Structure 1
Amino acid sequence: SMQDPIADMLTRIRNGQAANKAAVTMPSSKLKVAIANVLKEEGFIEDFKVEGDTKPELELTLKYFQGKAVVESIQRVSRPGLRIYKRKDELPKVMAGLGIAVVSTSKGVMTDRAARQAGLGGEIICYVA
C-alpha cells in the first residue's frame, strides 16, 4: 500500500526528469509542500502550485538546464523502515556541499546549510544531488 508518500514524491520527480516531463502532479500534503518549497528555494525545480479544494494536487514544474536535467539524483534517506535522525555535528553534506540535503528540524523543513547555520539538527529526509 502507500506507506511512504515522500519517497513517492521523489520517485515522481526522478521519473519525470528521466522522461523529459514538463511537470509533475501528485496528491499534496503539508510535508510535500514544505519539501517542494525547499526545492524551489534551492533551485532544483522551477515552480510548484497546489490546487484543488477537497483533494489537493501538488504540481511541480521541473527544470532542465541544457538538454540534461537539473535534479541529478534525488534519494530518500529517512525511510519508514529505518528513520535517520542526525545531530548538528553529524549533519551531512552531499556532493561535498554541491547538493543539499533536506532535513526536517524543529524550526521547520530546512536544508543542511540552513540548519547547520541555525545550530540545530534533525531528521534527514532526502539527498538532492
Structure 2
Amino acid sequence: VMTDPIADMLTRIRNANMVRHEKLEIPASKLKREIAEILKREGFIRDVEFVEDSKQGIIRVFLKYGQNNERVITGLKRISKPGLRVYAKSNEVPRVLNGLGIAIISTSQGVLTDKEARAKQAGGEVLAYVW
C-alpha cells in the first residue's frame, strides 16, 4: 500500500538527518532519481548513486555535514499529498524562506525548482519543501 513513495522518501531522509546517518536505500523511482539529482546540484547532498538491480533498482544518498556538527537538511515537508493536490501558477510560485530554501515543483517541461520555474514562466505540482 503505502499510498505514496515520495512522502516516505522525504521522511526517511528526515529520520536519517535526525540520527546523523550517512547512507540510505530506496526503491529509486524515476521521480526519486530526479529529486535526488536536484538536491545534489543544490548542494544539499554530498553525492548520490543509482543501483539498477533485478528487483526494482536502488539509489544511495550520502547526507552532507559540511561543518563540525550541522544538519544541512534541517527539515522537509510535502504538500501535494495523494488526496489534496496543490497546483501553483507561474505568478503564484512560492519562495522558501525569502529564497533561502528551495521547493521542488513538477512543471509542464521537466521537474524544476521554484527559481527555475519562475525564470521559465511555468508552474505545476508543489510536491515538496526544503529548509
When normalised by structure 2's length, the TM-score is: 0.94
Aligned mates of 2:58, 2:40 — CA distance in 1? 17
Deviation at 1:52, TM superposition (A): 3.0
1:1-12 pair list within 5 angstroms: 1-12=1-12
Question: In the alignment, what sits opposite 1:63?
Answer: 64
Aligned mates of 1:115, 1:124 — CA distance in 2? 11
Runs of 5+ in structure 1 lacking a partner? none
Structure 1 runs, 4 residues or longer, greater than 3 Å off: none
**AA partner of residue 88 (structure 1):** S
1:23 has 2:23 as partner: yes
RMSD: 0.9
1:83 has 2:85 as partner: yes
Runs of 5+ in structure 2 lacking a partner? none
Question: In the alignment, what sits opposite 2:101?
Answer: 99
Aligned mates of 1:77, 1:87 — CA distance in 2? 15
When normalised by structure 1's length, the TM-score is: 0.96
**AA partner of residue 22 (structure 1):** E
For 1:77-111, what per-residue CA distance to the aligned partner results, in whole angstroms no more than 9, with x for missing partners?
11102110100111100111000000001111110
**AA partner of residue 50 (structure 1):** F
Secondary structure in 2 matching 1:7: helix
Question: In the alignment, what sits opposite 1:38?
Answer: 38
Secondary structure in 2 matching 1:64: coil
Secondary structure in 2 matching 1:18: helix
Aligned mates of 1:52, 1:122 — CA distance in 2? 29
Deviation at 1:24, TM superposition (A): 1.3
Normalized per residue, which structure has more strand?
1
For 1:107-126, what per-residue CA distance to the aligned partner results, in whole angstroms no more than 9, with x for missing partners?
11110001100110111110
- Equivalent pairs, count: 129
Aligned mates of 2:62, 2:25 — CA distance in 1? 9
Deviation at 1:53, TM superposition (A): 2.5
